[PDB]
Amino acid sequence: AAKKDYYAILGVPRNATQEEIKRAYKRLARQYHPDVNKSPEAEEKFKEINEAYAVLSDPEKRRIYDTYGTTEAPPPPPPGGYDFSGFDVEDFSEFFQELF
């Protein structure tokens, strides 16, 4: 329900560029990816990192996230829904499911 802080998960400011987001994700993926790190702690952290990246790496989805909780009126969801190809979305947080 409460707004997750995807910027804190990746270690970047709210005003980060998409390039900065990409490089922060890559730094973390090099550490927590399944076949480099087989620990359960790595699995759970990487889940969080992937959801954060799923949202923040697509500028259009990032905008929806950034506007969440503000006093600005929200945009009606677009035709067909959203597209999170290359992400394990069915297992993402209830905040994510609610937001998108």
From Swiss-Prot:
Keyword annotations from UniProtKB, A to Z: Chaperone, Cytoplasm, DNA replication, Stress response
Gene Ontology CC annotation, any one: cytoplasm
Chaperone among keywords: yes
Lineage top rank: taxon: Bacteria
Keyword Chaperone set for record: yes
GO MF assignments: unfolded protein binding
Annotated compartments: Cytoplasm
Chain ranges of the J domain: 5-69
GO-annotated biological processes: chaperone cofactor-dependent protein refolding; DNA replication; protein refolding
Entry's transmembrane regions: none
Broad class of the protein's primary localization: cytoplasm
Reported function: Does not influence ATP binding or hydrolysis nor ADP release. Exerts influence on the interaction of DnaK with substrates; in the presence of DafA, DnaJ inhibits substrate binding, and substrate already bound to DnaK is displaced by DnaJ and DafA.
Assembly and binders: Forms a heterononamer with DnaJ and DafA in the resting state. Three copies of each protein are present in the complex.
Annotated family: Belongs to the DnaJ family.
Name of the protein described by the UniProt record: Chaperone protein DnaJ 2
Species the sequence originates in: Thermus thermophilus (strain ATCC 27634 / DSM 579 / HB8)
